[PDB]
Amino acid sequence: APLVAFQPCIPSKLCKIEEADCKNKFRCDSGRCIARKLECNGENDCGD
Amino acid sequence: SSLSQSYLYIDWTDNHKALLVGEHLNIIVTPKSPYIDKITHYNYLILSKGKIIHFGTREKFSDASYQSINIPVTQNMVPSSRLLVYYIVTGEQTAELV
Amino acid sequence: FLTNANADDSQENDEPCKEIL
Amino acid sequence: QEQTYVISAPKIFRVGASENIVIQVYGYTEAFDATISIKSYPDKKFSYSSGHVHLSSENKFQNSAILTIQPKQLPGGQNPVSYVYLEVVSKHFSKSKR
Amino acid sequence: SCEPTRGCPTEEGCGERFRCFSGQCISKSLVCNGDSDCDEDSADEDRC
Amino acid sequence: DKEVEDCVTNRPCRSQVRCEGFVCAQTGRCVNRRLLCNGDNDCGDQSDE
Ligand SMILES: [Ca+2]
């Protein structure tokens, strides 16, 4: 049998999560804030 | 920009000159679509201030044209009003709100 | 609107509108 | 996707206003019912207003409910409620939206 | 054969996501990615 | 092992299952409208292209 179980829920609170807003860094489409030196570097450094 | 290339064009001329209270408005609407076999009617909503004040349905005639929007412009419309018209149509499996 | 026919206006957000009539 | 629905509502609900909410269903050939409803958010604990509507060939599978948030039934407090759920329940479907 | 009390459930739509022809939903970042990102018959690659 | 003959018909028929697709000219296949002009024969007898 399973050792952990999950059930749907009607929650009872909001979400307090925040955006990256990551200063000088470059936000990849996956949200990873890679170093600005890697913008147009010619290798895929976002993975994306 | 219909992904299904299915459209609903309101034939009206958008006029800045007012309709008179209680008069019959008569608007044609043409549902051009790949799937006109399935559009047995379109539906319409008349919105005045914030509220959907009238709603209804408009059936296909055998000539492949539809009941026009034939409504008296009743007193609840008087500063201005807005007409919206819509249908859902099916492909073989997919569907689009037009 | 709420519909199962493949759209949701949740993808759109307001502007301080100025188109005039 | 042969069976489908639309519910259409004001962009913002005004508290204390008699908001009218249209329903249209498609692809159905036996009559049924739905309960368009306004509920508290996040929790869905409190139904602020609910209406019960019959969908049939005789209604051309269209209806509307008139629903309101009574100003005193909101929980109030120091910073006021900014969101609410519009829900539908029916045989065949349910969904809700902020 | 039987007359059901309980009704047949509907689909729900892909909303802001791209609907593939199967009924599965994929992110609009994957449309015209140059990969067949919908399983089975790609549709994400159509007429780009 | 079988014999077949024609008749006059006094009964209705509904045999046309419709096609939201495209009806291929020779084969009568209903291809989905996205399959036209893909550079490929989906009708069996090339009619989609
Ligand atoms: Ca083809």
CATH of the domain at D42: 2.60.40.1930
d(CA F38, CA D97): 39
* Residue of D10, D27, D64 lying closest to B55 (CB–CB): D64
- Residue whose C-alpha is closest to residue B43's, from B27, B28, B59, B30: B59
User: Looking at this protein, which amino acid is placed at residue B34?
Assistant: P
d(CA F49, CA F46): 6
Burial readout F16-32 (b: 16 or more C-beta within 10 A, e: otherwise):
eeebbbbebeeeebbbb
- Residue whose C-alpha is closest to residue D68's, from D43, D94, D47: D47
Task: For residue B95, report the distance from its CA to the centre of ligand 1, in Å.
Answer: 22
Chain F environment of E47 (Cβ under 8 Å): 34, 37
Task: For residue E37, report the distance from its CA to the centre of ligand 1, in Å.
Answer: 20
| CB contact E25 to C (< 8 Å) | no
Rg of the Cα atoms in chain A: 18
Q: How many structural domains does chain D have? A: 1
> Does F32 sit within 8 Å of B91, measured CB to CB?
yes
Q: Nearest C-alpha of chain F: how many angstroms from E3?
A: 26
Chain D environment of C4 (Cβ under 8 Å): 1, 4-5, 93, 95
| Other chains touching C, judged by 3 or more CB pairs under 8 Å | B, D, E
Chain B environment of D4 (Cβ under 8 Å): 88, 90, 95
Residue F33: helix, strand or coil by DSSP?
helix
Are B39 and B67 contacting, i.e. CB atoms less than 8 angstroms apart? no
**Resolution (Å) of this entry:** 3.3
Binding residues of A: 38, 41, 43, 45
> Does D4 sit within 8 Å of E7, measured CB to CB?
no
Burial readout B76-94 (b: 16 or more C-beta within 10 A, e: otherwise):
ebeeebebebbbbbbbbeb
CA C6 → CA B8, D41, D87, E15, E39, distances in Å?
17, 25, 18, 5, 19
Residues of F (1-40) whose Cβ lies below 8 Å from B = 18, 20-21, 30, 32-33
Are B52 and D8 contacting, i.e. CB atoms less than 8 angstroms apart? yes
Q: Give the pair of three-digit tokens for residue B16.
A: 């800045």
DSSP C1-21: -EESSS--GGG----------
Are D89 and D53 contacting, i.e. CB atoms less than 8 angstroms apart? no
User: Looking at this protein, which amino acid is placed at residue A27?
Assistant: R
Q: Nearest C-alpha of chain D: how many angstroms from A18?
A: 19
User: Looking at this protein, which amino acid is placed at residue B88?
Assistant: I
Residue D17: half-sphere exposure toward Cβ, Cα within 13 Å:
14
| CB contact B35 to F (< 8 Å) | yes
Are B71 and B54 contacting, i.e. CB atoms less than 8 angstroms apart? yes
Q: Can you give chain A as a three-state secondary structure string?
A: CCCCCCCCCCCCCCCCCCCCCCCCCEECCCCCEECHHHCCCCCCCCCC
d(CA D89, CA A31): 37
Cis peptide upstream of residue D42 (ω within 30 degrees of 0): yes
Q: For residue D24, give its domain range.
A: 4-98
Rg of the Cα atoms in chain F: 16
Chain E environment of F37 (Cβ under 8 Å): 47
